[PDB]
Design an enzyme around this catalytic site. Structure first.
Site, PDB file in Angstrom:
ATOM      1  N   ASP A 151       0.825  -1.196   0.000  1.00  0.00           N
ATOM      2  CA  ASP A 151       0.000   0.000   0.000  1.00  0.00           C
ATOM      3  C   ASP A 151       0.865   1.253   0.000  1.00  0.00           C
ATOM      4  OD1 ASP A 151      -2.282   1.440  -0.219  1.00  0.00           O
ATOM      5  OD2 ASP A 151      -3.132   0.782   1.725  1.00  0.00           O
ATOM      6  N   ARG A 155       0.253   9.028   0.544  1.00  0.00           N
ATOM      7  CA  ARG A 155      -0.666   9.225   1.650  1.00  0.00           C
ATOM      8  C   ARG A 155      -0.266   8.352   2.839  1.00  0.00           C
ATOM      9  NH1 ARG A 155      -3.306   5.963  -2.244  1.00  0.00           N
ATOM     10  NH2 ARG A 155      -3.708   3.903  -1.305  1.00  0.00           N
ATOM     11  N   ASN A 156       0.602   7.354   2.602  1.00  0.00           N
ATOM     12  CA  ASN A 156       0.986   6.370   3.604  1.00  0.00           C
ATOM     13  C   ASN A 156       2.421   6.601   4.064  1.00  0.00           C
ATOM     14  OD1 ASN A 156      -1.201   3.860   2.239  1.00  0.00           O
ATOM     15  ND2 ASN A 156      -1.513   5.228   3.959  1.00  0.00           N
ATOM     16  N   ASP A 169       0.968   2.463   7.590  1.00  0.00           N
ATOM     17  CA  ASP A 169      -0.155   1.723   7.044  1.00  0.00           C
ATOM     18  C   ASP A 169       0.261   0.309   6.672  1.00  0.00           C
ATOM     19  OD1 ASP A 169      -2.756   1.456   6.752  1.00  0.00           O
ATOM     20  OD2 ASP A 169      -2.976   2.810   5.024  1.00  0.00           O
TER      21      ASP A 169
HETATM   22  C1  LIG Z   1       1.435   0.784  10.603  1.00  0.00           C
HETATM   23  O1  LIG Z   1       1.516   2.188  10.447  1.00  0.00           O
HETATM   24  C2  LIG Z   1       0.588   2.811  11.279  1.00  0.00           C
HETATM   25  C3  LIG Z   1       0.391   4.183  11.118  1.00  0.00           C
HETATM   26  C4  LIG Z   1      -0.524   4.861  11.920  1.00  0.00           C
HETATM   27  C5  LIG Z   1      -0.742   6.319  11.686  1.00  0.00           C
HETATM   28  C6  LIG Z   1      -0.274   7.165  12.822  1.00  0.00           C
HETATM   29  C7  LIG Z   1      -0.352   8.631  12.554  1.00  0.00           C
HETATM   30  C8  LIG Z   1      -1.340   9.300  11.855  1.00  0.00           C
HETATM   31  N1  LIG Z   1      -1.312  10.652  11.680  1.00  0.00           N
HETATM   32  C9  LIG Z   1      -0.275  11.350  12.216  1.00  0.00           C
HETATM   33  N2  LIG Z   1      -0.143  12.747  12.098  1.00  0.00           N
HETATM   34  C10 LIG Z   1      -1.052  13.596  11.452  1.00  0.00           C
HETATM   35  C11 LIG Z   1      -0.978  14.985  11.654  1.00  0.00           C
HETATM   36  C12 LIG Z   1      -1.853  15.885  11.033  1.00  0.00           C
HETATM   37  C13 LIG Z   1      -2.852  15.382  10.195  1.00  0.00           C
HETATM   38  N3  LIG Z   1      -3.705  16.347   9.623  1.00  0.00           N
HETATM   39  C14 LIG Z   1      -3.493  17.777   9.922  1.00  0.00           C
HETATM   40  C15 LIG Z   1      -4.174  18.688   8.884  1.00  0.00           C
HETATM   41  C16 LIG Z   1      -5.685  18.406   8.762  1.00  0.00           C
HETATM   42  N4  LIG Z   1      -6.357  19.267   7.705  1.00  0.00           N
HETATM   43  C17 LIG Z   1      -7.009  20.531   8.254  1.00  0.00           C
HETATM   44  C18 LIG Z   1      -8.440  20.752   7.760  1.00  0.00           C
HETATM   45  N5  LIG Z   1      -9.214  19.457   7.592  1.00  0.00           N
HETATM   46  C19 LIG Z   1      -9.933  18.974   8.802  1.00  0.00           C
HETATM   47  C20 LIG Z   1      -8.550  18.374   6.762  1.00  0.00           C
HETATM   48  C21 LIG Z   1      -7.060  18.610   6.523  1.00  0.00           C
HETATM   49  C22 LIG Z   1      -6.048  16.908   8.801  1.00  0.00           C
HETATM   50  C23 LIG Z   1      -4.828  15.974   8.725  1.00  0.00           C
HETATM   51  C24 LIG Z   1      -2.933  13.978   9.990  1.00  0.00           C
HETATM   52  O2  LIG Z   1      -3.892  13.383   9.167  1.00  0.00           O
HETATM   53  C25 LIG Z   1      -3.302  12.238   8.523  1.00  0.00           C
HETATM   54  C26 LIG Z   1      -2.043  13.092  10.609  1.00  0.00           C
HETATM   55  N6  LIG Z   1       0.730  10.762  12.903  1.00  0.00           N
HETATM   56  C27 LIG Z   1       0.661   9.423  13.050  1.00  0.00           C
HETATM   57  C28 LIG Z   1      -1.222   4.140  12.900  1.00  0.00           C
HETATM   58  C29 LIG Z   1      -1.014   2.764  13.068  1.00  0.00           C
HETATM   59  O3  LIG Z   1      -1.725   2.070  14.050  1.00  0.00           O
HETATM   60  C30 LIG Z   1      -1.551   0.660  13.900  1.00  0.00           C
HETATM   61  C31 LIG Z   1      -0.110   2.095  12.252  1.00  0.00           C
END
Ligand SMILES: COc1cc(CCc2cnc(Nc3ccc(N4CCC(N5CCN(C)CC5)CC4)c(OC)c3)nc2)cc(OC)c1
Length: 289
Positions: A151, A155-156, A169
Site C-alpha cells: 500500500d 498518503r501512507n 499503514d
Molecule cells: C502501521 O503504520 C501505522 C500508522 C498509523 C498512523 C499514525 C499517525 C497518523 N497521523 C499522524 N499525524 C497527522 C498529523 C496531522 C494530520 N492532519 C493535519 C491537517 C488536517 N487538515 C485541516 C483541515 N481538515 C480537517 C482536513 C485537513 C487533517 C490531517 C494527519 O492526518 C493524517 C495526521 N501521525 C501518526 C497508525 C497505526 O496504528 C496501527 C499504524
C-alpha cells in the site's frame, strides 16, 4: 492474548482530536504519560488507532494483525514505530508515534507555489530527492524483514516535525518469511492506481510489486502530490496498463530521476531494481545535487 512488555496503562492515556479514518480503524491524537521511558513523568503526543463506530469482526482482526506486523518488523528511523497498546479491560487502542506534519501527499500539496496574485519554508529539488531516498531506505529495511507493504503511496508516508519520512499503514502488509511472496486468491479493496500488473491481474505480490508502487510515489513526489490517472475508471487503467502506457515525466523531474522512475515500471518484476539498488541510485543523485 497477553503481551505485558507492550501493554500500556489506560489511565496514563488521554484521547484527543481525530487525525482521520481508514478502512478498518480511525486515528486520534492522544497524550500518553511516561511513554518516554527516560522521562517517566511527562505527557507525550502519540497517535492512537482504534475501531470505527461501524467496525466488523474482520476489522478487529485486521487491526490486531497490523499491530503484530509492527512488533515483528522492528524499529527503523524511516518507519512509523509502535509505542504500546491497551489490549486488556477495554477497547483496543494501538499507540504509535505521532507525525506532526501529516502525510507526504498533503505535505507536498501544502507547499506548492501559490501563484503571482494568490496567497493565504519552501521546498527545493534536493528536498524532494531526500524524501524519495528516505522512503527507499525504509522500504529496504522493510523488505529485509521479509515483509511486503502492498500500500505504498504518498498518503501512507508521514512527515515528522523534523521532516523525517516515516512509512505507515501496514493494513495490507504481509509476512513472507516462508515463500518470499504473497498470492491474494481473493477479491478485495485495492490501491489500484499504485499497483503493478502482475499484482493487479494475476494477484502476485513481491518486494518487486512494492518497487512498482514506489515508482508511482516518485511521480507523486516530483509533481508535488499529483493524483495518478485523475478521475480515470478502473477499466481504463486496466486498458492503459495492458497497452503498456507509462506516466509522463513531471516538470520538476530531471532525466536521471525519470530513468529511476521508468526502471521501477518494467513489465517483468525481475527487471525492476531492488530497494537496495534504489537506495544506491537515489544516494548518487542526492550526491550530485
Ligand atoms: C502501521 O503504520 C501505522 C500508522 C498509523 C498512523 C499514525 C499517525 C497518523 N497521523 C499522524 N499525524 C497527522 C498529523 C496531522 C494530520 N492532519 C493535519 C491537517 C488536517 N487538515 C485541516 C483541515 N481538515 C480537517 C482536513 C485537513 C487533517 C490531517 C494527519 O492526518 C493524517 C495526521 N501521525 C501518526 C497508525 C497505526 O496504528 C496501527 C499504524
Amino acid at each position: 492474548p497477553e503481551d505485558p512488555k507492550w501493554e500500556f496503562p489506560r489511565d496514563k492515556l488521554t484521547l484527543g482530536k481525530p487525525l482521520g479514518e481508514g478502512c478498518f480503524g480511525q486515528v486520534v491524537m492522544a497524550e500518553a504519560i511516561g511513554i518516554d521511558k527516560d522521562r517517566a513523568a511527562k505527557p507525550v503526543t502519540v497517535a492512537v488507532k482504534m475501531l470505527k463506530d461501524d467496525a466488523t469482526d474482520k476489522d478487529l482482526s485486521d487491526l490486531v494483525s497490523e499491530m503484530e506486523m509492527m512488533k515483528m518488523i522492528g524499529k527503523h528511523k524511516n518507519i512509523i514505530n509502535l509505542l504500546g497498546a491497551c489490549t486488556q479491560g477495554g477497547p483496543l487502542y494501538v499507540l504509535v508515534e505521532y507525525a506532526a506534519k501529516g502525510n507526504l501527499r498533503e505535505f507536498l500539496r501544502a507547499r506548492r507555489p501559490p501563484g503571482l496574485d494568490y496567497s493565504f519554508e519552501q521546498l527545493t529539488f534536493k528536498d524532494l530527492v531526500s524524501c524519495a531516498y528516505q522512503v527507499a531506505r525504509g522500504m529496504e529495511y522493510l523488505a529485509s524483514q521479509k515483509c511486503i507493504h502492498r500500500d505504498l503511496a504518498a498518503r501512507n508516508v508521514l512527515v515528522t516535525e523534523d521532516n523525517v519520512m516515516k512509512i505507515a499503514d501496514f493494513g495490507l502488509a504481509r509476512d513472507v518469511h516462508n515463500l518470499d511472496y504473497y498470492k491474494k486468491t481473493t477479491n478485495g479493496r485495492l490501491p489500484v492506481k499504485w499497483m503493478a500488473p502482475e499484482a493487479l491481474f494475476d494477484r502476485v505480490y513481491t518486494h518487486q510489486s512494492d518497487v512498482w508502487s514506489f515508482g508511482v510515489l516518485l511521480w507523486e513526489i516530483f509533481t508535488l502530490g499529483g493524483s495518478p490517472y485523475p478521475g480515470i475508471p478502473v477499466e481504463e487503467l486496466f486498458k492503459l496498463l495492458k497497452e503498456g502506457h507509462r506516466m509522463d515525466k513531471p516538470a520538476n523531474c530531471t532525466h536521471d530521476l525519470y530513468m529511476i522512475m521508468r526502471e521501477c515500471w518494467h513489465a517483468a518484476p525481475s527487471q525492476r531494481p531492488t530497494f537496495k539498488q534504489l537506495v544506491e541510485d537515489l544516494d548518487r543523485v542526492l550526491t550530485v545535487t
